[PDB]
Design a protein around this ligand. Structure first.
Ligand SMILES: [Zn+2]
Lengths: 162, 161
């Protein structure tokens, strides 16, 4: 449940190349596990929407034109090399627990998603978690706004309505 | 269907008066149950923050609301049965004895529809466990394109410096 800082991300991407790099970008964009991202086919990307299939239930996550352009243009990543990815990751983040390299980028997506004001519920869906309790590992990263009781109530913080 | 629409709210408030109206406004603002709102005292409102006592929890309100409800017990001329009658007239299909909670559900429901956090809602409602609050989860928009803009690459292909 560790994650990469902004600066760790920067180093990671600088140090990777080829399909590993593209996969990293995809995982950082979508919260994909390494495996499901690496096995991805052209047909799983329709109108800038990536579909990770049934194995864990299916789920779909949108990506920018730029990302879609870069990763697509059969299997998208035939020259993926997980061990080299792992090596490079461990070099940037030495304190990373064993075999957690498959999930580090997923946890980085999630973590920054919450830090940046994302909804825990939307995140649950994006990650394809069956239960919200799974997604609550990222909850403490969220800012909390009790004054939303005022502005989001159905009177909009007033006395009237509408 | 468990809660009041915007238009049902409008009718309800138009049709109530006196302390009932104020209580309704308070429940719609805070997710208060009828009872805990009706039994509220001046001392439970400090700096535009309402405290519902013994599990206790505190919920902020706008100046306007505080001004209106706090000029002892705030609502000595409350009349629940009249409230109930009026509610039933606006929303006939409302389940039995649910009139005490209809406004709490409407607060919660709109809070989520309007983009509120399920976690914050948990705290506001004073739910012990998030699972209790997940009854309102399906009302949340799921703005999947936030996967793009809230990315650690900000939807791009690369890092910043
Ligand atoms: Zn209830």
């Amino acid at each position: 449940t560790g994650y990469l800082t902004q600066e760790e991300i920067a180093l990671l991407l600088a140090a990777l190349d080829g399909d590993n790099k593209k996969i990293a970008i995809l995982c950082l964009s979508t919260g994909a596990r390494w495996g499901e991202a690496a096995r991805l086919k052209a047909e799983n990307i329709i109108h800038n929407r990536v579909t990770f299939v049934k194995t864990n239930k299916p789920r779909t996550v949108p990506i920018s034109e730029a990302v879609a352009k870069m990763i697509a243009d059969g299997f998208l990543f035939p020259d993926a090399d997980y061990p080299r990815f792992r090596r490079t990751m461990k070099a940037i983040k030495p304190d990373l627990p064993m075999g957690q390299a498959t999930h580090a980028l997923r946890h980085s997506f999630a973590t920054h998603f919450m830090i940046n004001g994302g909804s825990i519920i939307t995140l649950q869906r994006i990650l394809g978690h069956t239960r919200i309790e799974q997604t609550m590992v990222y909850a403490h990263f969220a800012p909390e706004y009790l004054q939303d009781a005022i502005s989001l109530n159905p009177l909009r913080g007033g006395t009237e309505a509408e």
